[PDB]
Design a binder for this molecule. Structure first.
Ligand SMILES: C[n+]1cn([C@@H]2O[C@H](COP(=O)(O)OP(=O)(O)O)[C@@H](O)[C@H]2O)c2nc(N)[nH]c(=O)c21
Length: 178
């Protein structure tokens, strides 16, 4: 068995407006092994098969994929917005590449600023994002942004923005662009 450098947790969010947002978050499984990642990945629905309004989140064990976690509170997210009709060709590839980024510790010296990532499957258009711990840590955020952006192979001339969770919770947006 080939250990991962971090133990990871896959969370599911159910669009169920009859329950508060927090109660719609459910833990699916945790893994700290390459084999257990693949065993999880290979036997769970693709983000694209999720119902509109549902999210899959992959966060470091002990960090709940919500703004309220101490590790997310002062954080922010690198938000990748997907075009709705590109769902089929981009969504699952981007999500997997993202999990691999997290899991593979592709952010190196800035690995500890990464909290996890969330894939929001939405009718208006999907979003994938990586949650970092301090939206004030420009270097960390920028590095994670540049590495991440390159990894997914997003058109280089298009910019992706990083929003702080604080602004996301009080919007009527970008802290950094990359
Ligand atoms: C990530 N997140 C989302 N929400 C709530 O869910 C709403 C929907 O936000 P969304 O599901 O992230 O994307 P969407 O607007 O395209 O559907 C937010 O505006 C908040 O009301 C959240 N609410 C809480 N309390 N904590 C969170 O971490 C959190």
């Amino acid at each position: 068995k080939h250990p991962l450098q971090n133990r990871w947790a896959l969370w599911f969010f159910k669009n169920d407006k009859s329950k508060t947002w927090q109660a719609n978050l459910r833990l699916i499984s945790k893994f700290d092994t390459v084999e257990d990642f693949w065993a999880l990945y290979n036997h769970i629905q693709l983000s694209s098969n999720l119902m509109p309004g549902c999210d899959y989140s992959l966060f470091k064990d002990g960090i709940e994929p919500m703004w309220e976690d101490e590790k997310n509170k002062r954080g922010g997210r690198w938000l990748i917005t997907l075009n709705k009709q590109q769902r089929r060709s981009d969504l699952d590839r981007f999500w997997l590449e993202t999990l691999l980024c997290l899991i593979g510790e592709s952010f190196d010296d800035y690995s500890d600023d990464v909290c996890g990532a969330v894939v929001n499957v939405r009718a208006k258009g999907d979003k994938i994002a990586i949650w970092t711990t301090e939206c004030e840590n420009r270097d960390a955020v920028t590095h994670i942004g540049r590495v991440y952006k390159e990894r997914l192979g997003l058109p280089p001339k298009i910019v992706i923005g990083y929003q702080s969770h604080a602004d996301t919770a009080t919007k009527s947006k970008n802290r950094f662009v990359v």
